[PDB]
Ligand binder design. Sequence first.
Ligand SMILES: CNc1cnc(C(=O)N2CC(c3noc(O)n3)C2)cn1
Length: 167
Amino acid sequence: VNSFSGYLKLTDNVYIKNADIVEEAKKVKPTVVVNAANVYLKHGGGVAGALNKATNNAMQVESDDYIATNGPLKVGGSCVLSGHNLAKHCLHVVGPNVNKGEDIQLLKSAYENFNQHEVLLAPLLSAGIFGADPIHSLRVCVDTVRTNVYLAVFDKNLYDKLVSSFL
Ligand SMILES: CNc1cnc(C(=O)N2CC(c3noc(O)n3)C2)cn1
């Protein structure tokens, strides 16, 4: 028994809620929040910018030090950094950005990073400004992640469509 509330059970291990992931993290303070990162950990907009803004830019400062030491992530890859005021840890995961010509087949590799963590609060990877169809992202999530994932989907209309069309 954990502290997530009002999630709709989609599968054995996937739950879903209409919520802004930033607001959910501030309330729950989960062990792991997933960021929709890019390989440079440049969190200017989207989920990353919203999460980073909620940390008063401390996420960006930590991220810049990480990149200066380690270089960029791979598309499909991840790193674990601090969760600041939002979580114990932030798992920065790079889904493919369709708008940049990245291979959608890398979405499954991106979701595999979630399996290293027992429980996560997460958005749908490659959604929003990453340009993939959320319905596909949810299918890959369900078919790839075996650990307990709590999906916070910002758009109420997208949320309703995700649930209603779920197989
Ligand atoms: C001000 N707070 C926020 C929160 N989120 C975003 C964002 O860019 N997105 C992409 C959206 C999404 N649709 O589905 C899934 O899983 N995520 C959520 C921006 N600002």
